[PDB]
Amino acid sequence: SLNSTGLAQAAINGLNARFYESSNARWSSDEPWWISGVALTMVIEYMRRSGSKEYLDQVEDVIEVQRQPLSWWPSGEGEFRADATDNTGWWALAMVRMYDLTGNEDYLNISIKDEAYMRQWWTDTECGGGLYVDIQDLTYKNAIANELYLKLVASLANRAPNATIYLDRAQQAWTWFLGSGMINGVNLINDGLARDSNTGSCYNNRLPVWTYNQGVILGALVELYHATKDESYLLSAQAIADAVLSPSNGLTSSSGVLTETCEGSDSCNQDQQVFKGVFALNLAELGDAVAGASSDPDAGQDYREYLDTNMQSMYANDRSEIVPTLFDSSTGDLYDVSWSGPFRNATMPKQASAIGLYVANI
Ligand SMILES: OC[C@H]1O[C@H](OC[C@H]2O[C@H](O)[C@@H](O)[C@@H](O)[C@@H]2O)[C@@H](O)[C@@H](O)[C@@H]1O
Ligand SMILES: OC[C@H]1O[C@H](O)[C@@H](O)[C@@H](O)[C@@H]1O
Numbered sequence: 001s002l003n004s005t006g007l008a009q010a011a012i013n014g015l016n017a018r019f020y021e022s023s024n025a026r027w028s029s030d031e032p033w034w035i036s037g038v039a040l041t042m043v044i045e046y047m048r049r050s051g052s053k054e055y056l057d058q059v060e061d062v063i064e065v066q067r068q069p070l071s072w073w074p075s076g077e078g079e080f081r082a083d084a085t086d087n088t089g090w091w092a093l094a095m096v097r098m099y100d101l102t103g104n105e106d107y108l109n110i111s112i113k114d115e116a117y118m119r120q121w122w123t124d125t126e127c128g129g130g131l132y133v134d135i136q137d138l139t140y141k142n143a144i145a146n147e148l149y150l151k152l153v154a155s156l157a158n159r160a161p162n163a164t165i166y167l168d169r170a171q172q173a174w175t176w177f178l179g180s181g182m183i184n185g186v187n188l189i190n191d192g193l194a195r196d197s198n199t200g201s202c203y204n205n206r207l208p209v210w211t212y213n214q215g216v217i218l219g220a221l222v223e224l225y226h227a228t229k230d231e232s233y234l235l236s237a238q239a240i241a242d243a244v245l246s247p248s249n250g251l252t253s254s255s256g257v258l259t260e261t262c263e264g265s266d267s268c269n270q271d272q273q274v275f276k277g278v279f280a281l282n283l284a285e286l287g288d289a290v291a292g293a294s295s296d297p298d299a300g301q302d303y304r305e306y307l308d309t310n311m312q313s314m315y316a317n318d319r320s321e322i323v324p325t326l327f328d329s330s331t332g333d334l335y336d337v338s339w340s341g342p343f344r345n346a347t348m349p350k351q352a353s354a355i356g357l358y359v360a361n362i
């Protein structure tokens with residue numbers, strides 16, 4: 001059959017052999033720094049779900065160096081506090097997984113510092129809530145930043161000492177998100193909000209439906225369920241997932257393969273190349289929570305069936321292997337952006353998204 005653990009490791013090896021920079025303790029300095037954080041999450045999640053620890057030394061090197069005050073944002077004072085709330089949020093969630101893997105209070109403390117940094121740009125005076133993404137400009141409360149923050153406070157509500165204040169913040173944050181309008185008529189999440197020129201009220205800006213904006217919210221609702229034992233959160237998550245799996249909504253191909261909207265025009269940029277893996281890994285948390293929340297053995301079978309279907313398509317259609325040489329004995333797998341289309345080339349955001357799908361099936 002298909003050993004997702006073996007292919008995850010081969011993909012991580014391929015990510016490392018092509019894109020990891022030993023001298024910089026980071027993958028691909030020419031790609032968005034926040035995608036290095038996503039990559040770290042995938043490697044941590046692989047280790048956490050497979051029981052292996054083969055990349056734990058490497059992960060710890062990356063943390064120690066990216067922990068330092070950023071050259072492009074020294075006012076953050078390190079600990080991943082960067083020039084945007086979504087930048088910070090990706091690394092914050094990686095530290096939560098780091099904590100889950102190791103149990104070291106140190107990583108949890110980074111997440112606590114990051115929550116407090118992000119909340120600095122939560123304002124109740126515009127849109128009745130939510131935080132801005134552009135720390136320097138304060139012109140956009142989008143979906144990804146508030147989804148990341150929501151999943152952070154919901155995670156802290158399950159792990160941090162003053163867990164109650166985080167439960168209050170997460171419940172208050174989910175209420176704002178739900179009533180914000182970003183969840184549209186088919187239970188998908190548009191990119192962000194826009195503000196009325198004359199009235200100051202906000203509305204769904206009808207910008208694209210990105211796959212990672214339907215994933216991160218699922219993890220937040222799963223964490224909100226673990227902290228409250230309220231299945232209504234799982235039900236809300238399940239509706240967002242169900243809309244994604246529905247081919248009528250354009251996210252799922254006629255072959256049952258997840259497809260970013262830019263894949264058609266072949267115009268997926270550095271950011272959008274990683275979106276799919278973020279959704280898959282989050283849907284795996286939904287499927288796991290759903291299967292355990294009920295005695296039914298078929299609970300979440302469709303989410304697992306979906307991830308499996310997508311894995312075999314990416315394995316057969318999107319895969320390419322590195323050429324070993326007399327000097328470089330490094331082996332592994334490389335992956336392009338389309339989980340059904342051909343393999344043209346591999347980039348770090350595409351590779352990280354491939355790892356996410358394999359880890360989602362581990
Ligand atoms: O490509 C769709 C997104 O494009 C814009 O943001 C790009 C990325 O910039 C940030 O630094 C990262 O943290 C990412 O989270 C973010 O996607 C925004 O318009 C965003 O809302 C779009 O979804
Ligand atoms: O993501 C890469 C990261 O490093 C660059 O040097 C800066 O311009 C940042 O604004 C950017 O976010």
Ligand SMILES: OC[C@H]1O[C@H](O)[C@@H](O)[C@@H](O)[C@@H]1O
Nearest residue numbers: 139140141192193194195205
């Ligand atoms: O339209 C919503 C939003 O779209 C853009 O991506 C942002 O740069 C903002 O200027 C604007 O408010």
